[PDB]
């Protein structure tokens, strides 16, 4: 496991142990988006505006149809536990596509009920309706409370132009979502107490189940996470400060987050997770396997830590650690017990660890801070694993090796001659 | 490469009848679920829907302008689609195109591929 | 979806036995595991037993060796035999179905109440 | 060309041959955006709000002017076929800048007509006008149908506040576009039957032709693609599944798309293309030259295929291929003719290819599927080209080589001493 | 310093010397955003809509609170110049976090005044108020001029629905900003003569000072740059054209921008800067240290320039330089004094430099241009530093070296045996 | 832009000859190729001939050796000599200009009709 | 914030001397440098002198060796002694505080006017 | 791991009194600035606020529904929070939860952590 | 480095005349198409436009406030711009700035570079 104390001596600071919650299961609910609003048949107003709006919808529902059809074509008995799902189609489908296809076979039993509700949704003037399966008609609330009043108040031709503007606004917001798809977008259009669980729920991708090109309807499966806290799992953030080697600034280029699961130690790719104050909520395990030298470094064999040169000011030169300061006092003006007493670190030491046992007040570049009395902050280190991050640099040093290798081969040829 | 080839168009007397055919090389098509249908174009106008058929179920669909006048049929073993036109009228003169496309093929935006079209001229 | 319908709940004397049954209908060829969940009053759901399509079976620590789970695939039924009913075992029991795509489906819940003895 | 059958044996799955259409020519049309709306001179309402709106416009039209001026300064007889375009200016201009500059010399003959229409657009109250060259006045439809009615209905001071809000909304949507520029954005502001040809047209970049800082006007050249289908051109998607080497998971890191043009075989960077159901529509040829080892691998010399370690679950472990399954049955529970009969692949085999001649029902991790009877799915392989993707890993292994190289040189020195 | 003349001979074109301005100091202003609008207490309308809106606000103000709380916890006498700032907390804080924490200690003296104004802001119906510290109430202008008129005109129940829609629009725009934070976003919601200085001011990040979960208020510190022009500082853009080596296209992969500060020569990462017509405005010094071979190359030792193969058409094949053309005339049809006279460059020359002393009219691929009479445009070059950009390519060539190294070791073993 | 104006269309007897002409005006120093395009009734446009500013010339397979294209640069004219007119050659013929930046400009079209013979 | 209040401006005869003073209050433990700025009529602000919390001090080229800056930390005062007042030195003088986080604070400005002599 | 454990709930006669206690393992909590408070839930309703106390300042806060009936107190050395209920009424029957959370803890969305709750039944 | 240097300002009697000049080091300017012009500022007000001239065409532009009173001129060989003011009025007292900038230089936001300004005081 992580040896946090030794890693400080190479400027590697491991902090903020947070737990992890994974959405190992999902509860599914269905949403029917009915994109054409209903205008009262008594007046026939807005027909031309709906015709133009329909022409815009084709530019996003037809691409959705093509994608869903491609998923349905992966699989050409069923309805029995442990039965066969279907026949493999002629083509190629990766595991991601097979899972998507299998999910649609599971949703098939719902589609036969949704196809009944669609007949009721057609003639209905309601904006939101539930039969559970929820159905929404795009602009229908605005039509009921703005356009239908207008047709009496202002006459048919003036009110049609008001509908056209509303429909074109709705098309612009539809394009942002459908032009995977997260619940956050759908919830934005149509408007447990942990805020972070709510935020994570909107992060989950919705699954398209049907795209009806006749009635301009999209059926979506909404997935609600069931969150389970994994035991013996800790995610740490790690920061590296500059490390002095003969008056040149180096640092250990470790990944931004690391993870432990008992004896396993690896990185964490939390880019898809929601970071709460005390835990990460992730759709799946973010762990990945580290380079052998990085894993060995983190396990406390700090001689193995890879090091690279500091190219910019993004790398911090100092940090607070456990009530004291860990800093590169060559490039940072470390000061002890008053702004005049500079702490000098010898050229062969990489970072200075300053504790309350040595300084009551520590000044970093003039900033005076008191050390913490309850702080728990506590040899020759040679870091041979010099590393370059930039492909040009690696290529340049590879050319030097090849040049030296050709020279080595020549000595063999001449030496073989005298032999 | 999906290719569609129409045949059977020509000049015809009003009240007469004509039977169009379309041969389809659907083996290259990326799906097995699709409609086939017929469209017509006047030289200054958009392509009107004329008929469509579900290639698997055989359900036929027509616009109200032509209901009961024209009938669409298929033969899956021939890879052929047919449109028999009866009680022809002068307004029926147009280039007729067969298409393979997305259900319901009620509008030309839904087609995957288009034939070259055949001229039908109806004369009094 | 999958529809689950429990039966066999009721009152029972402690130390006795009860046999819960749950019928499933739907795209059951997509269901990875069937089993049973527990909630005691005022607390979260807990696993009791689950069985895979292959018959591989697992149990909660309280269930280990104490309960048995079984299925009949030709009629899509799931059964849990309760035996040596302890006073703590009174709870609402839900049958569940878990899909290969991680969807979870729940029954309505049926209540087992154990007498104070 | 691609040897799809052999590549399956290294877990490389080549699928979905799609054609390519390129916009080799463009038809140009001109659009004048007149950013200041006209308020009826009878009332002088809105003058103060327009002044504030003008001050906001400077923050985006002055940067446009500076960029356009920079393009016009590349070139300081003409109007004859094969004549000189102009004199090279004192400066530096890359081939991209020369093309932009030459395009402006071509547009010069249009500017002398646009400068006439600008005089009519000034006093006109019309929102869209054509003289073809199209001209649009920013909020003018709203001004005609909302603000001018208001000035009678509610008086001058109340209606000014309504104009100010409208202008600020228009500024926000102008900033998203102008703060290259695609036609999709312009079409969003101002509201053939193949949908994918329409989507590609909106993908094309507009060209700015004039920025008038006196009348607050932008002139744009809209380019309409002429699409031509290239013969003998096929674009394939390729997916790599995990490959077993002594119980460790490897894969071939091939590019996401590959392309053939007769004998030429290379990659395709379709990131700018529109993927239709049967073809890709691209502004220019997406092809790029592959590494010699990747081209040889794809040509069927599968011994040459580079291989790298599987670091995450993104790499699929199994796929459907031509009616059967290609999978790594070490980490995947492959099953034949019933969930109890596990398929065992030997440790020296990388992937298992399961066909209908061997299994009627194939189970992947419990998921049972029937094999396809009409499926067309059909030696010691040593993959020596081990490859690392991460610069740290390359640097670490380069240090080991250099360390071994210094040791080699020492043996030469002592051997030369005894000789 | 840069030797622009020699670098032309390797296709490296250094142009457009622009100065640099850095915001070395900032002037601070305070902005209080009060997110709940006030409705006239005489009617109690809109209470239910405000309750729902408040539930939405928690999804963005509570995450803001947690981040601000984390910053305040870094530091647990003060108010004297050169005094102690505070006590180091138990934890880890990087130099960036310490600077944020110190900034909050400086703002403490303002918070005791802002907490007085908050009592006046509560009951006030004004949308914008100043006491300087500016306070804004989210929808209050719309509420005053629309909802309050409505409550008489249409009744309490009809106007509540209008408030709900307005609040939900405001929440959507709040989420884009708060869901670092730039002044551009805040200025967008609530609506010196150099335009580029104004654009740079909006680029600066605002600092959150308080998040009041009782009154739903965010206090922000706005930072106004003080710009100072650095002397002896020049930023150059550099472009590389194709270079011929034995009929294969190579180029020098230099960084997009380079910088000089007297004798110092390095790169510039201007991605955060505003490029004006004559200077770059940057928040901090963009310079970074170049590879020794790149720095030596730019200093005029062009033998050291690293070279890489041209993989795509993005690399220009020709450019205008100082009144003439620098081009790869192998792949470009260079022509002199008429479209029929092709300029031939020998196979051992990388680029052809064509000046007014040799051609009056120069044709590039048929495009005829006159050379400039006032243009100032003016040996065996061996570029040994071959470089690969792609990790696969580096890894493949590293394996060949290791294979050659193992062969060398074998010769040592056998030669040691006979010795 | 470039303005293109054709002349020389009309009726012609099969086996005969006709000489189309097209005048161009505009920033013709930016035009890469001038030439002629064909559409037969009911089908897409097809290339006939094109000539570069250098005089390099190309032809469609039907035109190869059968037709000739020429220019006069001092008066910005483009000419196509039709000879051995076959019955299939009846079509609308457009002159075109192509810019170095890939812009294409079209004439109004002039119709050649060939008698049935 | 930091509040700065100057004193000691007024009229003075050339060749004489004057002693400006500025009082600071606020979170002065966050202040890196205190000092003085100058604007002559019609031109930008210019630095005169600054002093760090450590007493490290710097001067403009016109001030070098001619002026002296000092502080008293227990009472948060900043002083600039003007001596050998030249005719060009008439200006508005601002005291300033600069934070470690690059924030800058200004006084109200106090005017020094030097007689024509 | 922050854990809160309530105690003291039970059945009580109307007009009587009861004293709830909450023990808190706050050493693991990521902040030192927080409120602690009490919430109640009827089985069909959202958790109502009942009381909150500033852990550092000792300022107590109450909703108007209960002002003067209930009092909240703390003991920082015990890491304990108390709610003494006087003049109990039938409407007071609920599950009562102690929480540690963000100021002002006026609403349940602000809590960091929740206790398991204790049933209080008030009977005539 | 583009530098502008004004001269000629001073005190003048009402009804009198004054001639301003501006010398410009335009060789460093990034464009060859630009206007030059004159602006004036009262100490409490924004810079008003006064005159502008096209450096290539010589077209002059003026606001209506001063039409016929002031005239702008240039000499390209001197790199100089001139503004002769006649029939001066008390309202004309301002600091006057020459600028090089974007056409039409009708407003100060368009300037690339500014001179230091020269004070003109008009007195009865
Ligand atoms: C660190 O690792 C190296 C090689 O893996 C080993 O030789 C050395 O003994 C290790 N050090 C410790 C303290 O484990
Ligand atoms: C594969 O490539 C290598 C190197 O080019 C060659 O030695 C080998 O013979 C090739 N194999 C085949 C089957 O062509
Ligand atoms: C260029 O660099 C190499 C290596 O540093 C050196 O040998 C050579 O002399 C240099 N050339 C010049 C002109 O300085």
Layout of SSEs?
The complex is a heterononamer, with 3 copies of chain A (419 residues), 3 copies of chain B (124 residues) and 3 copies of chain C (117 residues).
Chain A: H1 4-7, E1 12-34, H2 47-72, E2 84-87, E3 92-94, H3 95-123, E4 128-130, E5 133-137, H4 140-153, H5 156-178, E6 181-182, H6 183-190, H7 195-203, E7 205-212, E8 217-229, E9 233-240, E10 243-245, E11 248-251, E12 257-261, E13 264-268, E14 274-275, E15 279-282, E16 287-288, H8 292-298, E17 308-309, E18 318-321, E19 324-327, E20 334-336, E21 352-354, E22 361-364, E23 367-370, H9 391-418
Parallel strand pairs in A: 1-5, 1-15
Antiparallel strand pairs in A: 1-8, 1-9, 4-5, 6-7, 7-8, 9-12, 10-11, 11-17, 12-13, 13-16, 14-15, 18-19, 19-21, 20-22, 22-23
Helix pairs in contact in A: 2-5, 4-5
Chain B: E1 4-7, E2 11-13, E3 18-24, E4 35-41, E5 48-54, E6 60-61, E7 70-75, E8 80-85, E9 94-101, E10 111-114, E11 118-123
Parallel strand pairs in B: 2-11
Antiparallel strand pairs in B: 1-3, 3-8, 4-5, 4-9, 5-6, 7-8, 9-10, 9-11
Chain C: E1 2-7, E2 10-12, E3 18-26, E4 31-39, E5 46-52, E6 57-59, E7 68-72, E8 77-82, E9 91-99, E10 104-106, E11 110-114
Parallel strand pairs in C: 2-11
Antiparallel strand pairs in C: 1-3, 3-8, 4-5, 4-9, 5-6, 7-8, 9-10, 9-11
The structure holds 2-acetamido-2-deoxy-beta-D-glucopyranose (NAG) (3 copies).
Residues 296, 301, 303-304 of chain E line the site of one 2-acetamido-2-deoxy-beta-D-glucopyranose.
Describe this structure in words.
The complex is a heterononamer, with 3 copies of chain A (419 residues), 3 copies of chain B (124 residues) and 3 copies of chain C (117 residues). Chain A has helices at residues 4-7, 47-72, 95-123, 140-153, 156-178, 183-190, 195-203, 292-298, 391-418, and strands spanning 12-34, 84-87, 92-94, 128-130, 133-137, 181-182, 205-212, 217-229, 233-240, 243-245, 248-251, 257-261, 264-268, 274-275, 279-282, 287-288, 308-309, 318-321, 324-327, 334-336, 352-354, 361-364, 367-370. Chain A is built from 9 helices and 23 strands. The radius of gyration of chain A is 32 Å and the shape is elongated. Chain A is α+β, with helices and mostly antiparallel strands. By secondary structure, chain B is an all-beta fold. In chain B, strands 2, 4, 5, 6, 9, 10 and 11 form a 7-stranded mixed sheet that branches. Chain C has 117 residues and is an all-beta fold. Chain C is 0% helix and 56% strand. Chain C starts with a strand and ends with a strand. Classes of the chains: A alpha+beta (419), B mainly beta (124), C mainly beta (117). The interface between D and E is large, with 59 and 58 residues. The complex binds 2-acetamido-2-deoxy-beta-D-glucopyranose (3 copies). One 2-acetamido-2-deoxy-beta-D-glucopyranose binds at residues 296, 301, 303-304 of chain E.
